[PDB]
Amino acid sequence: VEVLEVKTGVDAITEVECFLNPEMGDPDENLRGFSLKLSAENDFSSDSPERKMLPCYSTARIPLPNLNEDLTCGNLLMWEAVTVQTEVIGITSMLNLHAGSQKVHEHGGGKPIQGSNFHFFAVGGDPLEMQGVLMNYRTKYPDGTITPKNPTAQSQVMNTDHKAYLDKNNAYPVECWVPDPSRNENTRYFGTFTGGENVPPVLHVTNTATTVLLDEQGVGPLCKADSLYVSAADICGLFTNSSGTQQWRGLARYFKIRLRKRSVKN
Amino acid sequence: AITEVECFLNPEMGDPDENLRGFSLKLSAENDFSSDSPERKMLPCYSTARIPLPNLMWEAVTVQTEVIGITSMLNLHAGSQKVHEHGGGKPIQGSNFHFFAVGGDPLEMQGVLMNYRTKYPDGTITPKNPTAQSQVMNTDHKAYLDKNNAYPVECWVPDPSRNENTRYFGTFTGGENVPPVLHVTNTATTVLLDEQGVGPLCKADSLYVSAADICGLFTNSSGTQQWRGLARYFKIRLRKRSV
Amino acid sequence: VLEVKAITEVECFLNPEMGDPDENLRGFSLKLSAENDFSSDSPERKMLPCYSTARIPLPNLNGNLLMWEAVTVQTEVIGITSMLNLHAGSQKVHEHGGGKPIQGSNFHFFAVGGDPLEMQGVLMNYRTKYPDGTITPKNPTAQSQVMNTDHKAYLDKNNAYPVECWVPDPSRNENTRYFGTFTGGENVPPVLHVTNTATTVLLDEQGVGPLCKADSLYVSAADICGLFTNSSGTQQWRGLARYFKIRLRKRSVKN
Amino acid sequence: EVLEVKTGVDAITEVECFLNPEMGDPDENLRGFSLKLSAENDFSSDSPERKMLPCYSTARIPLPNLNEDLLMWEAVTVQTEVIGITSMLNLHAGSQKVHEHGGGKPIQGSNFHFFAVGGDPLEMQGVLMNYRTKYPDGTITPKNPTAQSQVMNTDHKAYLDKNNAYPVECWVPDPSRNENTRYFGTFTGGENVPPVLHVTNTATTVLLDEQGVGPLCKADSLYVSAADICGLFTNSSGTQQWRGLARYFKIRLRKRSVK
Amino acid sequence: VEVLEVKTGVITEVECFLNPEMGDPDENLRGFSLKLSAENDFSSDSPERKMLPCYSTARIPLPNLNGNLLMWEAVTVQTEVIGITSMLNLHAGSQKVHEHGGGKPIQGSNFHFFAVGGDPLEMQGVLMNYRTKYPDGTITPKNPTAQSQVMNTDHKAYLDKNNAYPVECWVPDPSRNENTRYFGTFTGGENVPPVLHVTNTATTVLLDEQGVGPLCKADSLYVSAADICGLFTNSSGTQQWRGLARYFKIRLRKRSVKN
Ligand SMILES: [Cl-]
Ligand SMILES: [Cl-]
Ligand SMILES: [Cl-]
Ligand SMILES: [Cl-]
Ligand SMILES: [Cl-]
Numbered sequence A: 001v002e003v004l005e006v007k008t009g010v011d012a013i014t015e016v017e018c019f020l021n022p023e024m025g026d027p028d029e030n031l032r033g034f035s036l037k038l039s040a041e042n043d044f045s046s047d048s049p050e051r052k053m054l055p056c057y058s059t060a061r062i063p064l065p066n067l068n069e070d071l072t073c074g075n076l077l078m079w080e081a082v083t084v085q086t087e088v089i090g091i092t093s094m095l096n097l098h099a100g101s102q103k104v105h106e107h108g109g110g111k112p113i114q115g116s117n118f119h120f121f122a123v124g125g126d127p128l129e130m131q132g133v134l135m136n137y138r139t140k141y142p143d144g145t146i147t148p149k150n151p152t153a154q155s156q157v158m159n160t161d162h163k164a165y166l167d168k169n170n171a172y173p174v175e176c177w178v179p180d181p182s183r184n185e186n187t188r189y190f191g192t193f194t195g196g197e198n199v200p201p202v203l204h205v206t207n208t209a210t211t212v213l214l215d216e217q218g219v220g221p222l223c224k225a226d227s228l229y230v231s232a233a234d235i236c237g238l239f240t241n242s243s244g245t246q247q248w249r250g251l252a253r254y255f256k257i258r259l260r261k262r263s264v265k266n
Numbered sequence B: 001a002i003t004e005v006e007c008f009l010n011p012e013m014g015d016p017d018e019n020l021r022g023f024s025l026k027l028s029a030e031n032d033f034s035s036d037s038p039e040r041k042m043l044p045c046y047s048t049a050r051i052p053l054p055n056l057m058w059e060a061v062t063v064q065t066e067v068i069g070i071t072s073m074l075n076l077h078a079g080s081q082k083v084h085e086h087g088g089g090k091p092i093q094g095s096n097f098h099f100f101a102v103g104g105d106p107l108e109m110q111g112v113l114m115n116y117r118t119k120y121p122d123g124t125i126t127p128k129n130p131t132a133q134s135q136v137m138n139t140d141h142k143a144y145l146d147k148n149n150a151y152p153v154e155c156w157v158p159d160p161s162r163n164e165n166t167r168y169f170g171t172f173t174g175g176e177n178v179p180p181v182l183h184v185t186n187t188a189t190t191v192l193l194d195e196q197g198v199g200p201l202c203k204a205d206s207l208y209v210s211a212a213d214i215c216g217l218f219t220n221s222s223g224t225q226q227w228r229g230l231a232r233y234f235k236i237r238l239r240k241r242s243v
Numbered sequence C: 001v002l003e004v005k006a007i008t009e010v011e012c013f014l015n016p017e018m019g020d021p022d023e024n025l026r027g028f029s030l031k032l033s034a035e036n037d038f039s040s041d042s043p044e045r046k047m048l049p050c051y052s053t054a055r056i057p058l059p060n061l062n063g064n065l066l067m068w069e070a071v072t073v074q075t076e077v078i079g080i081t082s083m084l085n086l087h088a089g090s091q092k093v094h095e096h097g098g099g100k101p102i103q104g105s106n107f108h109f110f111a112v113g114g115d116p117l118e119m120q121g122v123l124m125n126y127r128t129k130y131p132d133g134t135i136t137p138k139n140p141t142a143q144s145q146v147m148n149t150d151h152k153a154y155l156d157k158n159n160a161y162p163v164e165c166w167v168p169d170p171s172r173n174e175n176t177r178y179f180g181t182f183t184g185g186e187n188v189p190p191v192l193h194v195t196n197t198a199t200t201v202l203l204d205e206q207g208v209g210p211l212c213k214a215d216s217l218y219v220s221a222a223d224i225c226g227l228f229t230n231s232s233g234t235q236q237w238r239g240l241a242r243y244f245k246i247r248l249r250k251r252s253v254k255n
Numbered sequence D: 001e002v003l004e005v006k007t008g009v010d011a012i013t014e015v016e017c018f019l020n021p022e023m024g025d026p027d028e029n030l031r032g033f034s035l036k037l038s039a040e041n042d043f044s045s046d047s048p049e050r051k052m053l054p055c056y057s058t059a060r061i062p063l064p065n066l067n068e069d070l071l072m073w074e075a076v077t078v079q080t081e082v083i084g085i086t087s088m089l090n091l092h093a094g095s096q097k098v099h100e101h102g103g104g105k106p107i108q109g110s111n112f113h114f115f116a117v118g119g120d121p122l123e124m125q126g127v128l129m130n131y132r133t134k135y136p137d138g139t140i141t142p143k144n145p146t147a148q149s150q151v152m153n154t155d156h157k158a159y160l161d162k163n164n165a166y167p168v169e170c171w172v173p174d175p176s177r178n179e180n181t182r183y184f185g186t187f188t189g190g191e192n193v194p195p196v197l198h199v200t201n202t203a204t205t206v207l208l209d210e211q212g213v214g215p216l217c218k219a220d221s222l223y224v225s226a227a228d229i230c231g232l233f234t235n236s237s238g239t240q241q242w243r244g245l246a247r248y249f250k251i252r253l254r255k256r257s258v259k
Numbered sequence E: 001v002e003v004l005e006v007k008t009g010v011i012t013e014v015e016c017f018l019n020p021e022m023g024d025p026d027e028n029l030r031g032f033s034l035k036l037s038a039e040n041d042f043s044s045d046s047p048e049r050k051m052l053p054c055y056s057t058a059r060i061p062l063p064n065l066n067g068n069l070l071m072w073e074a075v076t077v078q079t080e081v082i083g084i085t086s087m088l089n090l091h092a093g094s095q096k097v098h099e100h101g102g103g104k105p106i107q108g109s110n111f112h113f114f115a116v117g118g119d120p121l122e123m124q125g126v127l128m129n130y131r132t133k134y135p136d137g138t139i140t141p142k143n144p145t146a147q148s149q150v151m152n153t154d155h156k157a158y159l160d161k162n163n164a165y166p167v168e169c170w171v172p173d174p175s176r177n178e179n180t181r182y183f184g185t186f187t188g189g190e191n192v193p194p195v196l197h198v199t200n201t202a203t204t205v206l207l208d209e210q211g212v213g214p215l216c217k218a219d220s221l222y223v224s225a226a227d228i229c230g231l232f233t234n235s236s237g238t239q240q241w242r243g244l245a246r247y248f249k250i251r252l253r254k255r256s257v258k259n
Helices: A091-095 B070-074 C080-084 D085-089 E084-088
Strands: A002-007 A013-020 A058-063 A075-088 A117-124 A129-132 A163-165 A177-179 A187-194 A202-206 A227-240 A246-250 A253-265 B002-009 B047-052 B057-068 B096-103 B108-111 B142-144 B156-158 B166-173 B181-185 B206-219 B225-229 B231-241 C007-014 C052-057 C064-078 C106-113 C118-121 C152-154 C166-168 C176-183 C191-195 C216-229 C235-239 C241-254 D002-006 D012-019 D057-062 D071-083 D111-118 D123-126 D157-159 D171-173 D181-188 D196-200 D221-234 D240-244 D246-258 E002-006 E012-018 E056-061 E068-082 E110-117 E122-125 E156-158 E170-172 E180-187 E195-199 E220-233 E239-243 E245-258
Touching (some): A013 A227, A075 A117, A075 A202, A075 A227, A091 E170, A117 A253, A177 A187, A177 B070, A187 A227, A187 B070, A227 A253, B002 B206, B057 B096, B057 B206, B096 B231, B156 C080, B166 C080, B206 B231, C007 C216, C064 C106, C064 C191, C064 C216, C106 C241, C166 C176, D012 D057, D012 D221, D071 D111, D071 D196, D071 D221, D181 D221, D181 E084, D221 D246, E068 E110, E068 E195, E068 E220, E110 E245, E180 E220, E220 E245
Antiparallel strands (some): A002 A013, A013 A253, A075 A253, A117 A227, A129 A177, A187 B181, A202 E180, B002 B231, B047 B206, B057 B231, B096 B166, B108 B142, B108 B156, B206 B225, C007 C241, C106 C176, C118 C152, C118 C166, C176 D196, D057 D221, D071 D246, D111 D221, D123 D171, D181 E195, D221 D240, E012 E245, E110 E180, E110 E220, E122 E156, E220 E239
16 A cells, blocks of 8 residues: 655645455465355255355555644545546466366366456445345355345345445455445445356456546545545456366456545535 | 435346245246246246326436346355366356336337247236237237236337337347346446437326346256346436426 | 428338248248258248338428438337247257257348348359249359349348348448348357437438438348257247338428 | 648549459359368478468559649548358358257358558568468468568568469568558457458448548559458368458548649 | 657657567477466476466667757557467368367467556566466566465566566556556457457557656667467367567657756
């Protein structure tokens, strides 16, 4: 994390940068960035996934410099997030087809990472707000995860009881939660899910691409209590081991966020 | 002057028992066209809701919408057939349909059938007195989407010759191995204004939302297959217009 | 072509013409044969999808004259959700599985003009012996497998011009606008969109749309959605109807 | 040096043509196809037959004669599409059944669609899969290639100056040249690649560069070039042949003043 | 440097064809990698040097232009992959798709990347397997840990040597590269079709949001690339990366700066 006062004064611009690590499970000390091997074919009535098999959302709160020296003034200053540049880091590491992966056929190279993937990021001045949805409401989730409380069959579609803040890194399983479009007035989020056994990962990098965070009235997220929130999930696909077992692979996400000072009423 | 309303519309995939809400009954295959009698719980239907408004007319101006719970398909540990020996479960994939409508009147639909001789089960509303022409265009088959969980998706499409007071959007992608591709963002808005700058006008102080979101097929360990659907969120901005 | 002068709307649903092998299978073709030698390729009539077309008469408005000018079209394929019936007739994807979706080669095409669509003949196999009731390239040669300029036709009859023999002619059609997409392959997914919010403008670079020459408006289409695979393994083309809503205006022209 | 566009009577013209594909044409009945594909030749003994090799198509269109000593014809737009795309809906003839009782296999697999419009012949750069390929009489291929010819060897410069002679697998348009040509190509490779081809008489490609100047036709000649390999046709035996289709061009030109 | 106005008056272009560095296992297999190994345990993963594609780079020298000084500024780049049609050779080396069929197209995982800057490309290391033992002649992350499989900020490198930095080890660094523009797309998968476009009508603008392009502060311009097109499958079943050269044409102008 770096917080840089690029310019000071009324038109002050501060740039925050950070690399958010993925939280795929990390089943042992040497497989950081991967999940535990996937189980299959568990009956809905006895589906008890292991902690390290479940990728979770990544998140961090980044403290910003205090702007208000007199807290009793009629007008106070807040940091306002105006743009974000972001990309997934280490995509070329998937070109290692010599280590660990099942050969595609006899005498062939290793099988590329492929299959279902999810790429998501958010930037806001409050924690990202999430809605819970489950494949199977009777899944017994493991200690260390935070998942929908008292789920019912309705939790497999929409159960409005399942509201949460993404307020803990490596705790909210990606399979249980989505960003909540009925809330998040102070966050911009973006995600794409692509499902399937053989789905090719497609990932772009460039330092020339910027996303604008301003709403239709020209206001970006406002950093409450001088806190900027970054969230991500970048499940790149499934790594298939020589044995045939499969593990999720994730990669870190870079953020560069440009902020300006907005005057608001107390 | 301006008001916003929102709704989470649940999918109606069939719901074969109390536990399998959001899924259909397992799919039958290979019925002859002359003896095709599908069970009610096997047929996804269109979802719809009528949203009352404060009582000039309310004009629908924009809609924000997205499919809810897409990441739930990352549960590959529960119920699904292994992709190979020692491998994880098979992702939901295959034919899918994503559709929504916003209107001041119920959605107007036209009936088209794969097989006109299909015997549809009690509880569904399907084209009446179908003929072979019902497999192409039979203009007799007009309906209003006036009941939730009743009009099967396979029997009905939005009618482009009507719907003067509704805007609708859908995409059908067919095939066994088709990957679901779903995007979420709170930064996308669809403007509902026509070329004259006029949106859907809510006739009896009612706003109509409609959806179908069949995400693909879930393959059980045994090889059987079931539709999986997801709820759809709507946030509609309305303004008052005099008439 | 002088000033614009007033406004009328026509709409039509054009049925597909996939072959219709019996009275129950409207919208399908006869099952496909395979592996006919080029020297003995005699397709049956009901196996061959043809272009759909209709002529829509308009009011007769007549030194100068007035003509109906086509300005915009809204069009879409009708019944796309019918392909979610995987219980009827289709081969199971595997044991205990649902039926196989319609998929594979598809062609989606429409045209709007004030003359019949002008077409160019091109054939896979020039030696194909086409059946009675079809209108195909006359006196074809090896060159008819590439470009043979002899093969000019008007789409002047419904359910007669096989889709496999004919394409819209880009060297002609001055008074028609046409649009088509061919996607080929064994397992290609059908992808079809619907919305009543999309309009195709028919005006050319000078703001002039198709002009209905003898008070007739022409619509044409082909919407082969893919192949339907029966339990036996036999395959049939499946097609769907196309809707047209065309807005016209009155235009002054010199005689 | 380019001056003002010239307007007036006869300052505009339009030309059109159809360019036939050059896929090999293995016998008198198989126009538009290649000879069946061989496979698995060692790089040291790779001798493709003439009729197995698709070649670029090209033609020169004469324009109304302007005095070369000052005006030149300037190509402004081109309308172009592939002709006969629906012919691939013939699945009854020649093609291997997809399975027992099934229809024939569609044409699919690797494909290349390319066109160019210019006031000079298209300038090409040679690149080879295998520098040791022994090309047959009747083809013009990179001369005296080396191992470097499998990547970039700048000796391999050629003009597309002969129809049905330059194999598509040996040559690409040269981005370091072609100051007076606009070219456009897409290669898609793979066994099962679906052909995707659009037609419409409403789409135009503008040939003007960033200064608003199109190709200038040197001696009242317009050069058109194309390659449209649509995929592989699979015979019932399992053998495979390239299938190609003709391309139509309609080019609009204007007179431009020069010095 | 404080950037002042563009120096106007009676702009230059430089160009380069940058060769791919796929490993080149012998004198005849320029542009390919060594055959790919598979299934090496993470604890004993020792790739041979000729199996590892590396980033390509070149330095283009420029003449010095000199209170206010002048520097060359890169405004636009035209770039494309060279030799894409070479993949239509399905007769040489590749395994037949089925009995009596043609050869298997190049397909599978591919990466296409370029950069243009006034300093060498700045890179960040990320590994599939931190315990990989890389071969002599490669430059790879130093003292990697488990954290090196996600983000380890210690792994910073300059692309300061051609055919040395393995593609699999390094990515352009978005936290640096203030004076370079880079662009890349990774497409992974066993059977991914290559899709490659060529046209001389496409230009990438290298100006930033203030209208300033990369500045050649030490009178040098840097081009960098990786173009792994896919995997070639030999008749034996073995697989090799295939790469192709990348063309660059960069338009430069003179920019005044404060000393
Ligand atoms: Cl909860
Ligand atoms: Cl009815
Ligand atoms: Cl004829
Ligand atoms: Cl040469
Ligand atoms: Cl390092």
